[PDB]
Amino acid sequence: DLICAQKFNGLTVLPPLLTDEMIAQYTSALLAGTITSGWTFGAGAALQIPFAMQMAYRFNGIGVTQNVLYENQKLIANQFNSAIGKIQDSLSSTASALGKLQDVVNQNAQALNTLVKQLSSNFGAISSVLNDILSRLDKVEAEVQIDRLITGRLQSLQTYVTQQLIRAAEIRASANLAATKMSECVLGQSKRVDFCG
C-alpha cells in the first residue's frame, strides 16, 4: 500500500489527535446546541428555546419581521426539508464538490510520492542504492559518492519540507476561516454579506 512503502523509508503518518468519532461528537454538540439552545451557547450557558421561535429571531437578523415565519412556518418547513434532500442527491453523484478536500489529500500524497521516488534517483552518483555504491568501491571513494546521494536527498527533503510549511500555512489560513465561520456563522448569525453564502 502507499502508506506501507512510506512507512518503510522513515515516513510515518502520526494519528490525528481527534478520531473521527470524536469530531462527530463536536459536530454533534455544536449542531445539537444550535438546534435547541439558539446561539446563546457560544456566549455562555446554553438556553433552551423553542426552535420555531429561534427562527423568529434569525429573521429579525435579516430584517424580515417575524410575523412572516409564524404564518409561513409550514411553507418554510418543506422548503427547508426539501432543500436538505437536494443536498444528499448532489453528494450521491458529485465527486467534485469535495474537490477542495480531495485536492488537499492528493497534493500531500503527491509530494509524498515524489519524495519517495527521489530515493531512486542517481543525483549524479553512480547508483541510487546506498550499499551498492559501497560494496562496489573502496570506501574512500564512497565518501565522495555518498555526498552526491546525501546532497541530493538532503535537498529533496528541504524541497519537500519547505513545501509542507508553505502548504501548511495555506491550510492554516483555511483553518482560521473555518474557525471564523464556525464561530460567527454557526454560533451566531452573520450580518456579513456572502460570508455564509
Partner 1 sequence: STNLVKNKCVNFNFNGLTGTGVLTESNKKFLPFQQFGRDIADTTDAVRDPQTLEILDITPCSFGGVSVITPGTNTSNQVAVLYQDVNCTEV
Ligand X SMILES: *[C@@H]1O[C@H](CO)[C@@H](O[C@@H]2O[C@H](CO)[C@@H](O)[C@H](O)[C@H]2NC(C)=O)[C@H](O)[C@H]1NC(C)=O
Give the span between the Cα atoms of 18 and 183, in whole angstroms.
20
Give the span between the Cα atoms of 19 and 42, in whole angstroms.
24
123 three-state secondary structure: coil
Binding mask 11-50 for partner 1 (x = CB under 8 A): -x-x------------------------------------
Stretch that binds ligand X, among 11-19, 72-80, 115-123, 161-169 (CB under 6 A): 72-80
Q: Does 166 bind partner 1 (CB under 8 A)?
A: no
Binding mask 113-132 for partner 1 (x = CB under 8 A): x--xx--x----------x-
Q: Does 78 bind ligand X (CB under 6 A)?
A: yes
Binding mask 52-91 for partner 1 (x = CB under 8 A): ----------------------------------------
Pick from 28, 24, 27, 50: which is nearest to 38 by CA? 50
* Pick 68 or 179: Cβ nearer ligand X: 68
Give the span between the Cα atoms of 174 and 101, in whole angstroms.
11
Q: State phi, psi for 70 to the nearest 5 degrees.
A: -65, -30
The listed partner (ligand X, partner 1, none) that binds 47, CB under 5 to 8 Å by sort, is none
